[PDB]
Amino acid sequence: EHAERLPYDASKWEFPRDRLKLGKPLGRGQVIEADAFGIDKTATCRTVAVKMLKEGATHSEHRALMSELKILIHIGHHLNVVNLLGACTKPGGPLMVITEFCKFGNLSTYLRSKRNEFVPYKVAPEDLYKDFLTLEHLICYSFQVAKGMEFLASRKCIHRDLAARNILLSEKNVVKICDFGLDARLPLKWMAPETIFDRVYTIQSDVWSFGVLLWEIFSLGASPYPGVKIDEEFCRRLKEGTRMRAPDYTTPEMYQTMLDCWHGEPSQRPTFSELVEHLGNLLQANAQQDRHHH
Numbered sequence: 001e002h003a004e005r006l007p008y009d010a011s012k013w014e015f016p017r018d019r020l021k022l023g024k025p026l027g028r029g030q031v032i033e034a035d036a037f038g039i040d041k042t043a044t045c046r047t048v049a050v051k052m053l054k055e056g057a058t059h060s061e062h063r064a065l066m067s068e069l070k071i072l073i074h075i076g077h078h079l080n081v082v083n084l085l086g087a088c089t090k091p092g093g094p095l096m097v098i099t100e101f102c103k104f105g106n107l108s109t110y111l112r113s114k115r116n117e118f119v120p121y122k123v124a125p126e127d128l129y130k131d132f133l134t135l136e137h138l139i140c141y142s143f144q145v146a147k148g149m150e151f152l153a154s155r156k157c158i159h160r161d162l163a164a165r166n167i168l169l170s171e172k173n174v175v176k177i178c179d180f181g182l183d184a185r186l187p188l189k190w191m192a193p194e195t196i197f198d199r200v201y202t203i204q205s206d207v208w209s210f211g212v213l214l215w216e217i218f219s220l221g222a223s224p225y226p227g228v229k230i231d232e233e234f235c236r237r238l239k240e241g242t243r244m245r246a247p248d249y250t251t252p253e254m255y256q257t258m259l260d261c262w263h264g265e266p267s268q269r270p271t272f273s274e275l276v277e278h279l280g281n282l283l284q285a286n287a288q289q290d291r292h293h294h
């Protein structure tokens with residue numbers, strides 16, 4: 001609330017505009033691809049994503065972007081939350097928020113591009129499945145998002161719109177939680193019943209959304225509630241207990257976890273801490289099935 005007015009450690013986040021080389025747009029504020037000169041002590045040059053205010057934006061829009069920067073600063077650093085690298089706030093140019101760049105984009109679109117490049121486990125010679133996704137990949141992604149959400153929860157922050165479209169995939173299969181801040185998106189399909197009917201958002205409603213995210217992950221980017229009209233009867237049957245069927249690439253345990261996240265009673269849903277532990281076990285157990293190289 002009014003985060004745009006929180007203290008700002010310029011010495012820690014301010015970055016010289018001239019050490020930035022803005023490139024092509026990635027989407028539209030508006031995110032642009034760019035090159036940064038020595039923004040971190042890990043490389044003198046690095047690709048980054050920059051979010052900046054459009055031309056002549058309202059004061060209200062200016063507060064909104066500044067509020068987002070303050071929230072990111074407040075949340076802090078975590079491997080599974082898009083990393084804030086710096087910002088350009090001082091006079092001389094536009095307000096700019098700089099984050100790490102995630103090469104592969106949103107997880108939803110990416111997964112759909114791998115529909116014909118997936119197998120539960122690779123079989124030697126593995127070169128036949130080069131760059132293919134496997135159950136280990138999918139469980140690993142689920143596990144990383146759970147850890148990111150567990151982190152946000154510990155910062156007392158509620159995402160409010162946890163979906164695969166808000167998950168970014170970087171290199172080496174590392175995923176980052178983000179928010180493009182968005183209708184044709186049918187956001188209601190990720191909303192918990194209490195949120196739909198009472199407009200209440202809580203870390204427990206986020207867990208419900210996490211369940212839909214798992215369904216998306218294990219359906220390889222399919223659209224939630226396939227072909228179902230999202231009208232009043234939908235909300236009615238949803239509150240009555242109607243749930244999605246198990247997606248194509250799920251495992252028995254992952255589907256049960258989805259069902260657990262979709263519990264009618266918010267308080268009966270698992271917590272992200274319990275999800276991190278549980279998903280960590282499923283990952284370890286999955287590896288136990290792939291023993292060719294032991």
Ligand SMILES: COc1cc2nccc(Oc3ccc4c(c3)OCCN4C(=O)Nc3ccc(Cl)cc3)c2cc1OC
Pocket residue numbers: 026027031049050051068071072081082097099100101102103104105106152157158159168177178179180
């Ligand atoms: C190559 O394809 C893309 C790769 C990208 N890699 C990194 C970042 C990208 O854009 C974003 C995405 C989200 C946010 C952002 C920039 O700037 C800061 C705000 N933001 C957030 O995620 N904010 C945020 C994060 C967590 C919480 Cl809890 C609240 C707000 C990208 C956009 C792409 O093309 C689409």
